[PDB]
């Protein structure tokens, strides 16, 4: 139920995602998830709903349904705050909204720095994203300070390719290794090489969009759908489980942390019931064979950023 991180802490293998969870619904969603047994919530300042996630955590802490030490709360530094001097302030904003005094894990959300400002996606006159001249290593140094200051227990990365990971690992005077690399992973984007790399380095991998993000912004024509894949539905039927339950279990048996999103009480409940069954190695190998290198999150607007992560094979 929990994986051991390189800082000695233990991360729940199941977490609740909150991207696209509306402010008006996410408080009840998180209260329900905690009641059901979730102990890990995935957040980000860019999701514009951390205050409302925080209301729910505060209510369950007050009710004594959980202790603070039993929860594992994750957030992420957005791209407009990569400058050394903006990092602490961005973390503290998130702490204020979540109404906590430390985060369990704080991730660099994307490797690409953008120009600082109010816009999450700063554009120039020709409509292009304006990049920061910051690099990944100076940002890492700023994240390490947060650990020394007691604001976060662990720090990590998200959407980093193996060369960008290696860059941090070979950083002169590296004080804290990345604990976690959070990446997109599901049967259409299986990530076998990047997962084996990170895992050989003792970095825990968290799979996001495990159900294929059916509620993502654009349903772009003849779009692949994991929940509706007849081959995956067969494997669920054989196990008497739903295709969502098979999609959540799959990464767990690869020793990945998985963070399905839902604001629906019965689905939040359904997605928890994945600890009592096992997919065979045959099932696993079959699910791995469906890889089509399909990404939900390709960050196409940043394809010419100096630190765009997806030009490299893995
Ligand atoms: N680091 C990054 O760059 C990054 C990027 C993307 C995502 N993430 C994290 O990963 C989380 C999960 O990814 P995601 O939100 O893209 O999508 P996801 O979990 O793959 O899919 C969420 C969608 O599936 C529906 N759903 C949930 N359980 C279901 C079930 N049992 N049966 C049928 N449908 C089900 C949800 O609907 P309802 O909500 O209506 O129930 C929602 O529409 C995010 O919320 C976020 O926390 C991180
Ligand atoms: O281009 C794509 O494939 C999809 N995509 C976007 O279109 C995008 C636009 C706006 C904000 C973002 C923040 C995180 C991730 C993405 C974006 C992303 O992957
Ligand atoms: O970055 C994240 O964590 C979440 N995220 C995506 O992964 C994403 C992928 C596809 C299209 C998008 C359009 C707007 C915003 C986002 C996206 C966004 O915030």
Half-sphere exposure in the Cβ direction for 209 (13 Å, CA): 22
Distance CA 104, CA 69 (A): 9
By annotation, the residues acting in catalysis are: 47
Exposed (0-12), middle (13-18) or buried (19+): which is 4, by Cβ within 10 Å? exposed
- Residue 238: left (phi > 0), alpha (psi -120 to 50), or beta? alpha
Residues in Cβ contact with 129 at an 8 Å cutoff, skipping those fewer than 6 apart: 114, 121, 122, 123, 301, 302, 305
| β-pair partners for 183 | 207
First to last CA, the chain: 28
Q: Is 217 in the pocket of ligand 3 (CB under 6 A)?
A: yes
Stated as kind and residue range, the H or E segment containing 272 is: helix 265-272
CA of 208 relative to ligand 3 center, distance in Å? 11
CB 270 within 8 A of CB 242: yes
CB 152 within 8 A of CB 146: yes
Stated as kind and residue range, the H or E segment containing 247 is: helix 243-252
Stated as kind and residue range, the H or E segment containing 3 is: strand 2-4
CB 137 within 8 A of CB 277: no
3-state helix, strand, coil in the chain (%, to 5): 40, 15, 45
The closest residue, in CA terms, to atom 39 on ligand 1 is: 262
Distance CA 123, CA 308 (A): 17
Please calculate the CA angle 270-182-212 and round it to the nearest 5 degrees: 45
CB 232 within 8 A of CB 287: yes
Ligand 1-lining residues (CB < 6 angstroms):
17-20, 42, 158-159, 182, 208-215, 227, 242, 244, 259-264, 267, 270-271, 297
Strand 16-17, strand 2-4: pairing? unpaired
Exposed (0-12), middle (13-18) or buried (19+): which is 221, by Cβ within 10 Å? exposed
Distances (CA, A) of 212 to 194, 207, 209: 19, 11, 5
Q: Mapping DSSP to helix (H, G, I), strand (E, B) and coil, where does residue 87 land?
A: helix
Exposed (0-12), middle (13-18) or buried (19+): which is 271, by Cβ within 10 Å? buried
Distance CA 41, CA 14 (A): 9
Instruction: Kindly report the backbone phi and psi dihedral angles of residue 228, in degrees, each rounded to the nearest multiple of 5, phi listed first.
Output: -110, 0
Stated as kind and residue range, the H or E segment containing 16 is: strand 16-17
Distance CA 244, CA 250 (A): 10
b/e per residue, 24-48, with b = 16+ CB within 10 A?
A: eebbebbbbbbeeebbbbbbbbbbe
Distance CA 145, CA 84 (A): 10
Distances (CA, A) of 45 to 76, 81, 114, 239, 243: 7, 11, 15, 38, 31
Q: Which atom of ligand 3 is nearest to the CA of 159?
A: 1
Q: Is 2 in the pocket of ligand 3 (CB under 6 A)?
A: no
CA of 141 relative to ligand 1 center, distance in Å? 31
Q: Which ligand is nearest to the CA of 14?
A: 1
Domains of the chain as residue ranges with CATH: 1-314 (3.20.20.100)
Strand 2-4, strand 10-12: pairing? antiparallel
Two structure tokens written together for 260: 């399905």
Full DSSP string of 74-85: EEEE-GGG-SGG
Distance CA 57, CA 155 (A): 21
Q: Mapping DSSP to helix (H, G, I), strand (E, B) and coil, where does residue 152 land?
A: strand
Distance CA 246, CA 274 (A): 8
Full DSSP string of 110-124: -S--B--SS-SS-B-
Q: Which atom of ligand 3 is nearest to the CA of 19?
A: 4
Two structure tokens written together for 277: 């069954």
């Amino acid at each position: 139920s929990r994986l051991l991180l390189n800082n000695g802490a233990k991360m729940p293998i199941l977490g609740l995602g909150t991207w696209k969870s509306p402010p008006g619904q996410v408080t009840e969603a998180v209260k329900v998830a905690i009641d059901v047994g979730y102990r890990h919530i995935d957040c980000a300042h860019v999701y514009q709903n951390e205050n409302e996630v925080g209301v729910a955590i505060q209510e369950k802490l007050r009710e004594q349904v959980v202790k603070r030490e039993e929860l594992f709360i994750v957030s992420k530094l957005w791209c407009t705050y990569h400058e050394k001097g903006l990092v602490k302030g961005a973390c503290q904003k998130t702490l204020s909204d979540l109404k906590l005094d430390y985060l369990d894990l704080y991730l660099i959300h994307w490797p690409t720095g953008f120009k600082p400002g109010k816009e999450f996606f700063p554009l120039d006159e020709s409509g292009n994203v304006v990049p920061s001249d910051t690099n990944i290593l100076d940002t890492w140094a700023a994240m390490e300070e947060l650990v020394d200051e007691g604001l976060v227990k662990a720090i990590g990365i998200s959407n980093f390719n193996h060369l960008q990971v290696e860059m941090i690992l070979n950083k002169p005077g590296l004080k804290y290794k990345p604990a976690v690399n959070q990446i997109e992973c599901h049967p259409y984007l299986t990530q076998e090489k990047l997962i084996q790399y990170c895992q050989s380095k003792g970095i825990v991998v968290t799979a996001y969009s495990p159900l294929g993000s059916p509620d993502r912004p654009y349903a772009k024509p003849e779009d692949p759908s994991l929940l509706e894949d007849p081959r995956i539905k067969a494997i669920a039927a054989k196990h008497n489980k739903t295709t969502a339950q098979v999609l959540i279990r799959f990464p767990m048996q690869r020793n990945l942390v998985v963070i399905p999103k839902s604001v629906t009480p019965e689905r939040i409940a359904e997605n928890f019931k994945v600890f009592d069954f096992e997919l065979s190695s045959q099932d696993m190998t079959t699910l791995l064979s469906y890889n089509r290198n399909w990404r939900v999150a390709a960050l196409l607007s940043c394809t010419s950023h100096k630190d765009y992560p997806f030009h490299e094979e893995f």
